[PDB]
Ligand binder design. Sequence first.
Ligand SMILES: *C(=O)CCCCCCCCCCCCC
Ligand SMILES: *C(=O)CCCCCCCCCCCCC
Lengths: 86, 86, 604, 604, 41, 41
Amino acid sequence: LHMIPQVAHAMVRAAAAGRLTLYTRTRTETTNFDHAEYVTCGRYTICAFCLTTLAPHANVKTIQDSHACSRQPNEAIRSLVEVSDK
Amino acid sequence: LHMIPQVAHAMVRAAAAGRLTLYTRTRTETTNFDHAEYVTCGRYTICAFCLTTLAPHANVKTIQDSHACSRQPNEAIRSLVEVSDK
Amino acid sequence: PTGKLWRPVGTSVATIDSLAIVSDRFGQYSFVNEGMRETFSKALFDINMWQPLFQATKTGCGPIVLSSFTTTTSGYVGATAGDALDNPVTNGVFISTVQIMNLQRTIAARMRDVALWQKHLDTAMTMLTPDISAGSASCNWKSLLAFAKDILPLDNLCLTYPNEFYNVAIHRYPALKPGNPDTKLPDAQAHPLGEVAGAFNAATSEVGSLVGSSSTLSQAISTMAGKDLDLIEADTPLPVSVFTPSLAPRSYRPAFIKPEDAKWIAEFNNSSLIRKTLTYSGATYTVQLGPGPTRVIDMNAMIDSVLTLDVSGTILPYDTNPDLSTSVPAFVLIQTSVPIQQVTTAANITAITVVSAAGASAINLAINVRGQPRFNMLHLQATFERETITGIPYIYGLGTFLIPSPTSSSNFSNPTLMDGLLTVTPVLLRETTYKGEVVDAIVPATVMANQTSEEVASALANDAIVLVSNHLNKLANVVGDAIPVASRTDDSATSAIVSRLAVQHKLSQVGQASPTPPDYPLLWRRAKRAASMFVSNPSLALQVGIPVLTQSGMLSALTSGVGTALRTGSLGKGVTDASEKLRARQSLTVAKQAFFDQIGSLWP
Amino acid sequence: PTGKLWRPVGTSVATIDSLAIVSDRFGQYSFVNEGMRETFSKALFDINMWQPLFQATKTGCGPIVLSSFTTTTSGYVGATAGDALDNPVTNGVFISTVQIMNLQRTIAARMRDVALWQKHLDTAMTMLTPDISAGSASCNWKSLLAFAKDILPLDNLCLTYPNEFYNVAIHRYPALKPGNPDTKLPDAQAHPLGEVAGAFNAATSEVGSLVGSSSTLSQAISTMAGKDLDLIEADTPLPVSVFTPSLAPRSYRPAFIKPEDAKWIAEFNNSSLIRKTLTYSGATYTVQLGPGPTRVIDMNAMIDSVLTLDVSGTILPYDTNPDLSTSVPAFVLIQTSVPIQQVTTAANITAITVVSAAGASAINLAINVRGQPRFNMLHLQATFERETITGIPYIYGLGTFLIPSPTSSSNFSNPTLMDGLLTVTPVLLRETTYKGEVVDAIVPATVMANQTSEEVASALANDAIVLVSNHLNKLANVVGDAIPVASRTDDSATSAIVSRLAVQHKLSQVGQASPTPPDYPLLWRRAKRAASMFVSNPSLALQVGIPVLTQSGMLSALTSGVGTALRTGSLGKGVTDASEKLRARQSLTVAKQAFFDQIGSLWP
Amino acid sequence: GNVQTSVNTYNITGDGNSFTPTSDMTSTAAPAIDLKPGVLN
Amino acid sequence: GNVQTSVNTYNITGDGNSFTPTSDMTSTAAPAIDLKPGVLN
Ligand SMILES: *C(=O)CCCCCCCCCCCCC
Ligand SMILES: *C(=O)CCCCCCCCCCCCC
């Protein structure tokens, strides 16, 4: 089973005080969501394409994954971070 | 099973406003509880000795029973009637 | 022996493997055991009878001998090589498959042929009751004939072949005795082909009728073993299946049923009103829970059924409180936080779902029937499901009103449409309900004398009570039917009970002066009305406070008596009141003789 | 044949009924099949060995020949007339009951006799390690003897009979080779009575030790079939019994466990405080539910256990808020109307029962340990029972404080004594718990990669998780033990997994450019650490987010591999690292030879 | 449907089997065996 | 305990039976039969 809603409760609390760092496929952080795949807190890591938990810990430089797709609303948590980043 | 507590809810509502009365073993009504056995509302009838339901009809003149025993507090419903009889 | 015939395929030595169903170009020869020839002979016999009508009408094809479909093979005949080895039959009589086909389609084709004629013969035969059941009674033949020459409608077949049907008839009605050719007089005895059968059906004056009294017994015996009347008050878990509950959808009238009289229905007994709101189809309505207690169907303790609350003919006072009109009546669930019967005000009611509203307000659903506008018969209806209410500790089904705007006028109204005739239909038999809980097994003995007067009539369609009532009801018709629990004959039923009362009243006398030697004439009579009161209203045995009937012994006792009682009736059980029964039959034959007397005069 | 011998009681013709256990004045002759003589001979053989010590000490009574307890009867020998008929044995060797008694009490009496001496021989034998496992190593006999002449304590029995024990010894230690009488020199070969057995235990340098490697396998095979490691990740309901949960009482530290990390523990997350009251033993106390969320043990989803909340060493700040002192700490149930996590204020809490208070206030239970007064180790403790909470939708166990008078001081305290080490012990194994519900069967595969890091460590003693952990743990010791999942030997375990990764990564490559031909050197190595990470911490396979291990294939796969892997180990499985293992044994014999060299000098 | 071979004279997946109801032979074993007291004896 | 008679050589309620454990014969059937691969063959 995908997510395990204790994970999603850590998504919103990291996005209601936006610490969420969106990482691309080349393991670099961006803030645009278009090139980004990995989503951190930094407790949990989720690739935005397949939308599954990947590592309990953060620092996505040490994660192995094989998925490939496109756009994935919810952008709403991504939108909630930049509002709460102020 | 004895009484069926729908019966006891009819005891107290007949004792909140005292209607009940106390019938003796010779099928005459008294108000002393010492010579009395049968207890009415007048929906349900209960002999005070064995304390079981006997006939939902009253007129305890038409009830057959065979029990014989003494000492039966609750006298409290008997006491609540004469206070509420005023 | 029985089954298909086999033969040693490996030859000579027939072992449990050197056999093989002797099949071939005709199919497989199946053995025709003694009794199975009785049937096909009894079937063909009933067709040959119509011989005179087959020739007359050039149909048929000669008499059908069963010896034309069989053969005289020989080998081992069983159901399987293994067991067929123990039935060496020599020159037995087997019928091959392709033959088992003709003896079939022949008896079928001929059966049509006769079934038709046989119908004409009848509209004419029974058209003068050739059957009396006490003494005799004639009717001078001339008249009789010259009479039916009339009545019989022009399209019978008894007018086209009189003594071509008559010859068939003479063999079916030992009433018509043909006049012997060489003495030109009747015969006293009547010789119809059904010689024996017809002899053993006559209502023998000694005992009603063997064919009757015999069946009324085997019939009861069937039930007794079948449904499982035995074990009727067994004290231990029993799968609802053991009660074969079917075609079981009982209907009520809640908003009247007291909450304690039937666990599946709690009420909002609160001081003031509890007006809540809910956006249903855009429009915002207000559920009321008005002045009175508003009894609502509880959802837990409600076996996933098909609740269909009908609201018709019931008053609809939109005339006075205009508040009522405009509100679409609708069955709605109500999830409350705090348990009902503890739910005080609106903030307490979690949510409210309109599980089924009625399109069009309360002023189109009306219909004036003398001032008091009634409800045009309409059925609102949910489909409650055990688990759609999982977790949810408190939730209630309520067929209320949904007022579009609460007012002062509806301050003493209380829009519960529950006064209507609700009809719950358990849609999932496996699960029953008892005392408010859903179960998979009942404990019979528990449900005896455990309900109150109305804790029975208020039972919920397919709940222990309704099951431990459907059961007694069968056992009630076995006694009512077979056993004579309705005469001063201290029958096996009222007798099983008497022995319990004795053994019971006898030990209650043990210890203490024993000043009262058991009665018996009074015990027999007390148990007679006990067994009788049961046959009468099977239900009672569930209500607390019923003399005798509700003591643990009885019933468990009764049935096991009635049980062995049926398994011994003899055949002449009909000897009971076979005197007045006889005298009544003579009474009829005297009046029927009176009829034949007119047929005899009018049509001379 | 086997069993007692029977004989034709009806004489001559022996049918399946003309037989009868041939009993008599001696009891019943039971047949002594070939192998059962191996035991009683092997037992007596080990006693005869001590012959030289039996005569020396005038005990015993001559050598015990097994041919003194048997006989040479003949008849049919089976377990029952029916089957004994198919075992006609002539002049077989049977032992009568009364004999089966002596061969028993003799081997028992003698067994004591020797068991004693045999103990003295030992404290002297092993008292100079007569066993090396690589190459040889002597120790000039004179010294050796003249040495033990010392060490051996004055109450042995090897000093009272030197060459009466020596002769017994020579047959047990192929180390002591007696000097031949007519050439006055050793023998090279050593001939101890255990000639073969002792040959097959030597640590053979080719492969560790046959006796070892053989058992370590049959041992693992036992478990594999026993507990039911097979079927370890079966996807379908399994009775808890199938998991033989025993000696299983896990302890925690709630008031810390997040509610979502373990369903059996909800919290009162409410704004302000919720001071309630309750007359306990006359005195009126106030349960607090202070400032923080106060996580409480939920009662539903709590398998009728034996909750024993220990409160010791934990802080007890009666020093600051004096309010805390005077209050007897006590585990108390709390029935709330509205569901917790929705229970706002006091009027919401139905009732509160002190299921177990601690006599004496919080100022006698204390004990100063450097300012911060702690709690004198004491155990409060309820005995929750599934049904004592029937109906009651909401109820929670809370080990709080029961303040005799709430004050401003205790306005930020929150007296939950749950910070203590609570120890629940399921007292009714049949029922397990999963995701908050009580069940009777688990679905293994469901519990894999379904818990979180701590949704495992927070498991409730005897709940699916704790059961699907106790299970993997066995299977984890079978691999850890038998299979070599701890060397670069790509063993059967890490091999079963590799085949899954391939078949898996291979189809995920099907459809689309297939630009990546499967790796394999990388797959072998990835699955090696997967099988290895499992043996390591069996638990992990339950946590969501573990590489390989948590895909449905593995485990179900692993086990069934490890399975067949054990059923083929051969005997010489010990060949693994049997090189360094060997070189290490020679290392020891070189150091032990060094010892004998001193025994050889010091005591010349 | 895995091949058996002798246990029973017919394979299920055997060659040329054929499900095909005929209004003519209504499939039926033996349920109504009479055992009632009078009728069994 | 109703009398049987021949089914089995002993009646339970039979004459002079006797429950009486003896430390000498510890009651035991055959549970530990060895079947493991190497040991069964
Ligand atoms: C092998 O067993 C494959 C499954 C084919 C038959 C299984 C049972 C379904 C067909 C029934 C045949 C016998 C009477 C229904
Ligand atoms: C008749 O069946 C009366 C009951 C007496 C025996 C029933 C079973 C209890 C005794 C067991 C005997 C066999 C081994 C325990």
